[PDB]
């Protein structure tokens, strides 16, 4: 537990190191230095909008992977003594890239509302881009996270499901409905993500 | 919990679908009824060849006989368990070593039993069970001296760590190998549990019943088998293995016990073996108390198939090929014996 | 033919025990038939005829012995092509014959060389020791001819320094050695090699002096043999081992030649041998699958069989008879029947890698649609779609063409190479993929990541400063620039066939191929889709379901059609209607569909594409969501009704269930699969940037280079560059395109109308040809 | 220079390829395609007075090719040579 120790200690450390740093700010009346404000508005909307395209993509095919890592893993192993689960359970493979698919989909449409400024001044970058950097970003997050999540519920329930066919060729059939019901979150995802963004206008 | 979800199958994925596999073709009780019809030890061969087994016995002489079958059924588990073992990484490598320490700690009584009667050791290897080789050089060409023996043991050994039980060689030639084997095994079984719990998760979820049952079914029948010999009550509560549920007050009274009656009241305050002693009759014509353990021991094996990302599946799958061997050599006994009354003896799984 | 399976029926046939081997010979020629277990209560190992199986599989054992001799040695194997029937007669008898003897011959005939050259190898030790050991006897002779112990042997080479200080450090100074080089080295008489060897003489005083010196030379694994005791003896001895040496040489040379002999006539019917075996090998064991005399002496036996060949299936039963000169004739008869038949697609050589490819996925029903036909177009079609491009689609297709030119020759010899074997089988696959993908590489205008220009652009650079506001000093200031339509003459129209080449130079490449072939892939997908839905249409039509083609079939495609074909026409709309003038305000698809499902036709932003979107939309919608329910509720309540209260299992709860996971299963498909054909551009675009990439990175190199030392330079860039687009390009990205055409066509399009629950069709075949 | 069929084999066919691919590419050079513009090697100072400069570099690039597709013909003529030794 050599790397978990090291990560335990950074985030310790780090979170000592803010509530320390919290503390002082607001005893010594320091707070207005704590400038929440000119950390969101300074910090370019371009930093937000591409670190949210990016996460869309990114973490969409990250949940694909593991899932179809972890899915992919239990249908080799139970194929050595039947075969047909290679034929068959190549569905969840399919939903866990559906996932990947849908990230792209919303990576596709997140950065289709981008568009450059020609300012610096906050008053002149305005509540129009700014707010459109923040959603887009956010749009990323729930897009990529929620089809990261759903990537690897699924390979986990393709895998049980592999597992389950490799002894009684008639359970896929009724355990593919659990893949179904992981699949919608990714669907969730992509619809909130388009609702974020709707509204959403760069320039 | 642990989450092993997420990354089981990054290491451990293929094995558990190739053990859960080689679990599907284990007899089914269906199959089980098929070689218990046979009428000679041919036909159970001819009708064992429509399942899993094939033809693992079609090459061996033609006049077959229960030790051929036992051989080869110990065979084909010692490959597919070697297999296995080859395939799989540190933390399932020492899980599948510690399952093979069980069959290690009789084969290194066999040979400490030899020795001291001053037997060549190269000459006791064959019979030592094949899961449980002792491949490294250390601890042969011995010249028959337990001193030596017990410093290969020591240094060139897995089993090093269970040998610190004992103070020293002389304990070898002191103590009794039956007190020697099951202190082994009750340092074995602790460490074995400690190691599960370490590994947590449905590992440790579905690993810890077996070996809680193991230690409650050793402490049962080291109480009950205790009772005319010249064990003392002090050096018995030693053999008890301190994983099972009994550890609170249970061994103790375990330990004070003087006969059955009484190791069945202790085993009253819990229910399941409570069932296991009840169905116990021990007379003549119906189960005795080591074929209920059996049952449950086996029916917990299956159990442990109800999980899915854990080690427990190979352990469960080890011994339920285990009995399911046992449980075809005791068919082809009892055809060879002509004993068909008994032939039902067999426990079945799944 | 290929468009659904053939009408399978079964059949039963009595026929009597003696004509029952040929008449079944006679079936497994002509292929037809496919026999069935009669006798499943006792295993395969205990049936009637298991005797006779054991016995051909022996005889197969022994062919495999004298064919892997044959291998063992040079000779080769025949080939004549022809494939005799096995002598139904007892004729098993004489083949057991011959083939015993052609064991036992080539047994004794290797033990018997074995032996002799053990023998012949040892003697010439022995002449060697001897002729060293007069020659060793030859300082002064002058006797004619006890105490004195001597022996003699041959020891390996450079061992004489360790074996020389072993005999002085043990018989310490009290024995004598002589040796001497044997030139010519031999052959060691059982470790088998070539090895030089040193011929020596040792002389001990008394007994123990030669049990030492005996057992030292034991453990350097010499070899000693006798020796003559007198003049006398050693020439005698000597002639008697040279005349054994020469006799022991005749005999292994004619041994030899025997086993050659014996050996070359094999070789010349090993394969008709083994055809014959294997057949009545395979004949027995099917034998065995029909009823035996334990219920009648007449044999009984139960196939399925083509209903067009049941004519032909009683011409070879009468060849069976005449053959067998039974006079009774056997009887073939039909049966009305219950099982489920399997399904026979009757392919052929071009067709072969079509259907396994569709087959791959599950084997189609019996009788249903079944995908090949329009998979031999469509599966290349989409695969080219991706992996569009002209030159990689010419190297493509004249590699299958060389395949299909050539398949003959590659059939003869075949090799073990799994990777090869699956291309060639799947040849045909491959030469249209090329095809196709020629053509989708001049639609692309893209040959090795460049274009074309065969009919000229029609963006003409010109009108920008003509009439537009351009100059050499605009051209100086801007680094890029770019280009517009809405001054008079720079687009002059669409190109004729395929993207315009300017493109390729244009910077702005990218942002328009993207859009293109995304609505390309919407397109197609769309359009694929709706085709296997007709096809399910036409599967319920035929196997008689009104119920899915009322409901099911007709809620999908107005489902489908109303929510996305209504995108493939706004596409093509929009393509059609907005131009550069109008580019300033010309809605996205993507935000009009989004909105056509949220409800949330704005007042602001982007305006409508036609009139009355709001309505025609909203219509679209509420039609859509009404499919819905259309699909869930009706059947189930249908089957209920005139399955339990007509005639009154049916469990109306699992039935619900089953029809809500159909219809939710469905629904969110038709997104998923709207989707997943977005797959077709992804693979589009990476192909044309990686192989853009590629070119820049390799060739580029070799182009840019003012001296003229650059064209030497072009030969190995250019070697470069071909090894690595035949291996990154037309390897691998050729096979993620093959086989995501294939996903597409299993999931997309197959889950529309194939349900491949079948069996594939097993017949007695003989293919032991091989 | 005996060597593997296999070998003499690839060898010709990379050598037919390349005689093509680089022919051609020559032609299109010397046609002065402007699509291989990208792969001229000029400098500023080739824009000066007009496109003389440019087409000049073009049939330099074309003449590279043109050797290159020589030198293949050759390699291509050993390989064959060696088939035929084989
Ligand atoms: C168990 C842990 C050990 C306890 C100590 C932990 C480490 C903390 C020390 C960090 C190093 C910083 C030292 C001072 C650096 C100089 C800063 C400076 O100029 O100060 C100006 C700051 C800010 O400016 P100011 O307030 O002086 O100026 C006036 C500003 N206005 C007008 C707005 C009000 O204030 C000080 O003068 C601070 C002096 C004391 C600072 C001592 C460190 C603070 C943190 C102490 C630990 C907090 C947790 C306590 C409980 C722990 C119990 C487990
Ligand atoms: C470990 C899990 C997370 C929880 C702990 C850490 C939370 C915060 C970590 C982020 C960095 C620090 C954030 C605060 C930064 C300072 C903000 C500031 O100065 O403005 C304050 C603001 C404004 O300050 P101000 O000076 O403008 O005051 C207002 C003056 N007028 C109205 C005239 C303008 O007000 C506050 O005091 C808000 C409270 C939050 C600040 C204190 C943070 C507490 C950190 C945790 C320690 C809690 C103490 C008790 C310990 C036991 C807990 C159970
Ligand atoms: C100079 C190079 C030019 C480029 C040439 C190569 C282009 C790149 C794409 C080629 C992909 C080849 C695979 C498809 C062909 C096989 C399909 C077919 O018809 O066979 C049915 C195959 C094999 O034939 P079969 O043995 O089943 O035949 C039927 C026989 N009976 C009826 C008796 C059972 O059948 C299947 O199993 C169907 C599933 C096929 C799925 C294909 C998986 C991918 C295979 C990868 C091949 C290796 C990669 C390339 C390596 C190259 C280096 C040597
Ligand atoms: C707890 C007391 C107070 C601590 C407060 C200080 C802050 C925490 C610092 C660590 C304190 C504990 C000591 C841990 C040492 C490092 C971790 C263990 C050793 C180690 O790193 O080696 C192996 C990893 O390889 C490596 O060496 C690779 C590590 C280097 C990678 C650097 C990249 C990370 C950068 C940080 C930002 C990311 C933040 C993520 C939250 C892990 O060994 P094992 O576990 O396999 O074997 C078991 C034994 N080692
Ligand atoms: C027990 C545990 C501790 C619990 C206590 C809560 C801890 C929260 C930690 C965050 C920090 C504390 C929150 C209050 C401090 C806010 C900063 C005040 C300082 C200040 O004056 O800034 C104003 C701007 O702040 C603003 O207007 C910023 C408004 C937003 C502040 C809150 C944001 C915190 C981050 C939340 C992220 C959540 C992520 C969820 C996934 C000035 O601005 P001005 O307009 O006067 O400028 C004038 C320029 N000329
Ligand atoms: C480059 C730009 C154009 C690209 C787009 C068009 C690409 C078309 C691809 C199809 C052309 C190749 C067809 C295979 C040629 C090899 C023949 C194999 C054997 C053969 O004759 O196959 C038969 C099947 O019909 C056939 O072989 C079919 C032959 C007639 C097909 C007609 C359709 C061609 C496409 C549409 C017209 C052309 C458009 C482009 C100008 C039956 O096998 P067997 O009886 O020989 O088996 C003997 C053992 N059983
Ligand atoms: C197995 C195959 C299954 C079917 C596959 C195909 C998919 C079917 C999709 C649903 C049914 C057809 C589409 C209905 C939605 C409306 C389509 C409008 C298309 C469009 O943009 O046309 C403009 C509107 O037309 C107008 O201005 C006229 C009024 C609006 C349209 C009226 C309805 C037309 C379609 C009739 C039904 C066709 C059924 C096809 C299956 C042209 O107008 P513009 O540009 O000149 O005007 C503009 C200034 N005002
Ligand atoms: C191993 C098997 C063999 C493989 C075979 C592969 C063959 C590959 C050969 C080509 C590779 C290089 C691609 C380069 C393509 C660009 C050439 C090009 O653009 O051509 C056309 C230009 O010359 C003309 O166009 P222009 O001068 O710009 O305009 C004038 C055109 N009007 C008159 C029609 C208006
Ligand atoms: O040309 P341009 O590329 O510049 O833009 P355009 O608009 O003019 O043309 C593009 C035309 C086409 C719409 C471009 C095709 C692009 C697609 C990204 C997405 C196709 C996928 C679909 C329709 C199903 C997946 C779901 C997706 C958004 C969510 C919808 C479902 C719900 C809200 C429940
Ligand atoms: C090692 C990990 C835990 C980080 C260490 C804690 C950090 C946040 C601490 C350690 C020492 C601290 C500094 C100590 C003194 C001063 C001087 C003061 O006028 C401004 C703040 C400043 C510059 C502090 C900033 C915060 C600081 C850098
Ligand atoms: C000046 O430039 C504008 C912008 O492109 C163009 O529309 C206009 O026609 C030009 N005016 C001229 C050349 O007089």
């Given at each position: 537990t050599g790397l978990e120790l090291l990560y335990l200690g950074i985030f310790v450390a780090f979170w000592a190191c803010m509530i320390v740093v919290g503390i002082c700010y607001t005893i010594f009346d320091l707070g207005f230095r704590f400038d929440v404000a000119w950390f969101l508005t300074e910090t370019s909307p371009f930093m937000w909008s591409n670190l949210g395209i990016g996460l869309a993509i990114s973490l969409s095919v990250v949940g694909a992977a593991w899932g179809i890592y972890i899915t992919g893993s239990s249908i080799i192993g139970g194929g050595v003594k039947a075969p047909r689960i290679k034929t068959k359970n190549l569905v969840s493979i399919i939903f866990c890239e559906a996932v990947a698919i849908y990230g792209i989909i919303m990576a596709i449409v997140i950065s289709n509302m981008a568009e450059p400024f020609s300012a610096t001044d906050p008053k002149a970058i305005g509540h129009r881009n700014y707010h459109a950097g923040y959603s887009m970003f956010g749009a990323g997050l729930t897009v990529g996270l929620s089809n990261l999540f759903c990537g690897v519920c699924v390979g986990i329930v393709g895998s049980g499901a592999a597992l389950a066919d490799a002894q009684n060729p008639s359970l896929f059939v009724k355990i593919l409905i659990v893949e179904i019901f992981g699949s919608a979150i990714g669907l969730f995802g992509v619809i909130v993500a388009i609702l974020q963004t709707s509204r959403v206008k760069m320039g | 919990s642990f989450f092993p979800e997420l990354y089981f199958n990054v290491d451990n994925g293929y094995l558990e679908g190739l053990v859960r596999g080689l679990k599907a073709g284990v007899l089914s009780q269906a199959d089980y009824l098929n070689l218990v019809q046979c009428e000679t030890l041919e036909d159970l061969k001819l009708h064992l060849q429509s399942t899993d087994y094939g033809n693992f016995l079609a090459n061996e002489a033609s006049p077959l006989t229960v030790s051929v079958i036992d051989d080869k059924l110990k065979e084909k588990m010692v490959v597919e368990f070697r297999h296995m073992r080859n395939h799989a990484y540190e933390p399932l490598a020492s899980f599948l070593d510690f399952i093979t320490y069980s069959y290690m700690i009789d084969n290194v009584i066999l040979l400490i039993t030899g020795t001291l009667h001053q037997r060549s050791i190269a000459e006791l290897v064959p019979k030592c069970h094949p899961l449980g080789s002792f491949e490294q050089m250390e601890a042969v060409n011995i010249a028959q001296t337990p001193a030596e023996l017990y410093n290969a043991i020591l240094v060139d050994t897995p089993l090093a760590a269970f040998f610190?039980?004992?103070?020293?060689?002389?304990d070898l030639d002191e103590m009794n190998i039956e007190i020697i084997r099951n202190t082994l095994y009750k340092a074995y079984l602790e460490s074995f549990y400690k190691f599960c719990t370490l590994l947590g998760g449905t590992t440790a979820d579905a690993m810890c019943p077996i070996l809680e049952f193991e230690a409650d079914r050793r402490a049962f029948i080291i109480t009950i088998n205790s009772f005319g010999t010249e064990l003392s009550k002090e050096d018995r509560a030693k053999l008890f293995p301190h994983c099972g549920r009994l550890y609170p007050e249970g061994l103790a009274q375990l330990a004070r016990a003087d006969d059955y009656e009484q190791v069945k009241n202790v085993a009253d305050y819990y229910p399941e073996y409570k069932l296991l002693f009840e169905g116990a009759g021990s007379n003549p014509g119906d189960k005795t108390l080591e074929d209920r353990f059996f049952e449950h021991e086996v029916k917990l094996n299956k159990l442990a198939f109800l999980n899915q990302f854990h080690f427990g599946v190979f352990y469960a799958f080890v011994k339920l090929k285990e009995q399911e061997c046992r449980n075809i050599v005791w068919i082809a006994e009892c055809i060879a014996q002509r004993h068909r009354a008994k032939i039902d003896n067999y426990i079945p799984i799944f | 033919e290929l468009f659904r399976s053939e009408e399978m029926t079964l059949a039963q046939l009595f026929l009597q025990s003696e004509a029952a081997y040929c008449c079944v010979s006679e079936l497994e020629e002509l292929g037809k038939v496919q026999f069935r277990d009669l006798n499943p209560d006792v295993n395969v190992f205990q049936r009637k005829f298991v005797n006779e199986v054991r016995r051909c599989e022996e005889m197969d054992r022994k062919l495999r012995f004298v064919e892997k001799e044959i291998r063992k040695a040079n000779i080769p194997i025949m080939d004549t092509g022809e494939n005799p029937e096995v002598p139904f007669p007892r004729d098993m008898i004489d083949l057991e014959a011959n083939f015993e003897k052609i064991e036992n011959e080539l047994k004794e005939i290797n033990t018997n060389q074995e032996a002799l050259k053990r023998n012949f190898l040892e003697l010439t030790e022995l002449k060697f020791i001897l002729r060293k050991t007069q020659q060793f006897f030859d300082e002064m002779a002058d006797p004619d001819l006890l105490r004195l112990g001597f022996v003699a042997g041959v020891i390996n080479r450079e061992r004489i320094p360790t074996f020389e200080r072993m005999l002085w450090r043990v018989c310490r100074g009290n024995v004598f050695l002589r040796q001497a080089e044997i030139e010519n080295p031999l052959e060691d008489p059982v470790t088998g090699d070539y090895v030089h060897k040193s011929v020596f003489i040792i002389f001990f005083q008394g007994d123990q002096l030669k049990n030492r010196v005996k057992k030292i030379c034991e453990g350097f694994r010499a070899s000693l043999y006798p020796c003559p005791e007198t003049p006398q003896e050693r020439k005698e001895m000597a002639s008697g081992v040279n005349t054994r040496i020469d006799d022991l040489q005749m005999v292994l040379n004619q041994t030899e030649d025997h086993r050659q002999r014996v050996l070359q006539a094999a070789a010349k019917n090993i394969r008709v041998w083994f055809i014959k075996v294997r057949k009545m090998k395979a004949i027995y064991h099917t034998l065995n699958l029909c009823n035996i005399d334990?219920?009648?002496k007449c044999l009984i036996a139960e196939v399925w069989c083509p209903v067009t060949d049941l004519d032909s299936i009683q011409f070879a039963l009468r060849r069976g008879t005449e053959h067998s000169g039974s006079t009774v004739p056997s009887i073939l008869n039909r049966m009305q029947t219950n099982q489920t038949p399997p399904t026979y697609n009757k392919t052929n050589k071009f067709t072969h890698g079509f259907q396994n490819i569709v087959d791959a996925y599950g084997i189609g029903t019996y009788r249903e649609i079944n995908p090949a036909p329009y998979t031999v177009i469509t599966f290349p079609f989409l695969f080219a779609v991706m992996f569009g491009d002209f030159g990689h689609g010419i190297l493509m297709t004249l590699f299958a063409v060389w395949m299909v030119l050539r398949e003959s020759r590659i059939l003869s010899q075949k090799n073990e190479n799994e990777m090869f074997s699956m291309v060639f089988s799947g040849r045909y696959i491959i030469l249209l993929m090329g095809l196709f993908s020629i053509y989708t590489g001049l639609i692309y205008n893209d040959c090795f990541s460049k274009s074309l220009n065969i009919f000229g652009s029609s963006w003409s650079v010109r009108p920008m400063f003509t009439i537009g506001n351009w100059t050499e000093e605009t051209l100086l200031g801007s680094s890029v620039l770019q280009l517009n339509?809405?001054?008079?003459?720079?687009?002059?129209?669409?190109?004729?066939?395929?993207?315009?080449?300017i493109w390729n130079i244009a910077t702005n490449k990218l942002t328009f191929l993207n859009s293109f072939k995304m609505k390309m892939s919407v397109i197609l997908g769309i359009i694929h889709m709706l085709f296997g839905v007709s096809l399910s249409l036409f599967n319920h039509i035929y196997f008689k379901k009104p119920l899915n083609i009322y409901f099911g079939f007709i809620p999908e495609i107005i489902f489908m059609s109303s929510l996305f074909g209504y995108l493939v026409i706004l596409i093509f709309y929009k393509w059609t209607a907005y131009d550069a003038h109008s580019s300033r305000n010309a809605p996205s698809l993507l935000i009009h569909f989004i909105n056509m499902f949220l409800f949330?036709?704005?007042?602001?932003?982007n305006a409508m594409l036609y009139s009355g979107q709001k309505g025609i939309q909203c219509f679209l919608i509420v039609v859509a969501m009404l499919c819905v329910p259309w699909m869930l509720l009706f059947k189930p309540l249908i089957l209920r009704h005139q399955y339990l209260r007509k005639k009154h299992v049916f469990d109306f709860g699992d039935t619900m269930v089953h029809q809500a996971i159909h219809t939710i299963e469905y629904c969110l498909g038709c997104i998923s699969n709207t989707a997943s054909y977005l797959r077709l551009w992804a693979l589009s675009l990476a192909h044309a940037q990686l192989s853009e990439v590629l070119w820049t990175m390799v060739i580029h190199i070799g182009l840019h280079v003012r001296s003229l030392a650059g064209g030497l330079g072009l030969f190995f860039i250019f070697a470069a560059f071909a090894t690595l687009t035949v291996a990154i390009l037309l390897i691998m990205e050729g096979l993620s395109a093959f086989l995501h055409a294939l996903r597409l066509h299993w999931v997309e399009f197959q889950n529309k109308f194939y349900t491949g629950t079948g069996f594939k069709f097993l017949p007695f075949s003989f293919e032991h040809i091989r | 220079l005996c060597c593997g069929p296999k070998l003499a084999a690839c060898g010709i066919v990379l050598s037919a390829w390349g005689v093509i691919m680089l022919i051609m590419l020559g032609i299109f050079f010397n046609v002065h395609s402007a699509v291989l513009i990208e792969d001229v090697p000029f400098?500023?100072?080739?824009?000066?007075?007009?496109p003389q400069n440019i087409y000049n570099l073009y049939e330099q690039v074309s003449y590279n090719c043109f050797i290159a597709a020589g030198l293949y013909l050759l390699l291509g003529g050993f390989s064959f040579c060696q088939v035929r030794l084989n």
């Open positions: - | 610190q039980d004992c103070i020293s060689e002389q | 334990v219920t009648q339509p809405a001054i008079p003459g720079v687009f002059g129209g669409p190109y004729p066939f395929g993207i315009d080449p949330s036709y704005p007042e602001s932003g | 400098t500023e100072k080739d824009f000066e007075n007009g």
